[PDB]
Amino acid sequence: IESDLERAEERAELSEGKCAELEEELKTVTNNLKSLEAQ
Amino acid sequence: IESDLERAEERAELSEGKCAELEEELKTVTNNLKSLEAQ
């Protein structure tokens, strides 16, 4: 169970990292889309 | 440790679902950007 928790936590931190870069990517791309559409 | 593991798994499934939703959002926004970039 300790090993289970260990690799579950590894997958956890990978997941939060993924969510972080994907969220900032969405923010940047949405801002760019809005700016371009404003023209 | 079992109590920790159950809730670790539950949040792990939740984070996987959130990652899938974010990936779908990324796909939609990038398709929108590709469509808009034509003109």
Swiss-Prot record, chains A, B:
It comes from the Eukaryota. Detected in primary breast cancer tissues but undetectable in normal breast tissues in Sudanese patients. Isoform 1 is expressed in adult and fetal skeletal muscle and cardiac tissues, with higher expression levels in the cardiac tissues. Isoform 10 is expressed in adult and fetal cardiac tissues, but not in skeletal muscle. It is found in: Cytoplasm, Cytoskeleton. Changing residue 4 to N: In CMH3; no change in homodimerization; no change in homodimer thermal stability; decreased actin binding; recessive effect in the homodimer; increased calcium-dependent regulation of myosin binding to actin filaments; dominant effect in the homodimer. The modification Phosphoserine is found at residues 3, 15, 35. Transmembrane segments: none annotated. Homodimer. Heterodimer of an alpha (TPM1, TPM3 or TPM4) and a beta (TPM2) chain. Interacts with HRG (via the HRR domain); the interaction contributes to the antiangiogenic properties of the histidine/proline-rich region (HRR) of HRG. Interacts (via N-terminus) with LMOD2 (via N-terminus) and TMOD1 (via N-terminus). The molecule is in a coiled coil structure that is formed by 2 polypeptide chains. The sequence exhibits a prominent seven-residues periodicity. It is linked to Cardiomyopathy, familial hypertrophic, 3: A hereditary heart disorder characterized by ventricular hypertrophy, which is usually asymmetric and often involves the interventricular septum. The symptoms include dyspnea, syncope, collapse, palpitations, and chest pain. They can be readily provoked by exercise. The disorder has inter- and intrafamilial variability ranging from benign to malignant forms with high risk of cardiac failure and sudden cardiac death. Binds to actin filaments in muscle and non-muscle cells. Plays a central role, in association with the troponin complex, in the calcium dependent regulation of vertebrate striated muscle contraction. Smooth muscle contraction is regulated by interaction with caldesmon. In non-muscle cells is implicated in stabilizing cytoskeleton actin filaments. Belongs to the tropomyosin family. This is Tropomyosin alpha-1 chain. The chain holds residues 172 to 210 of 284 of the full protein.
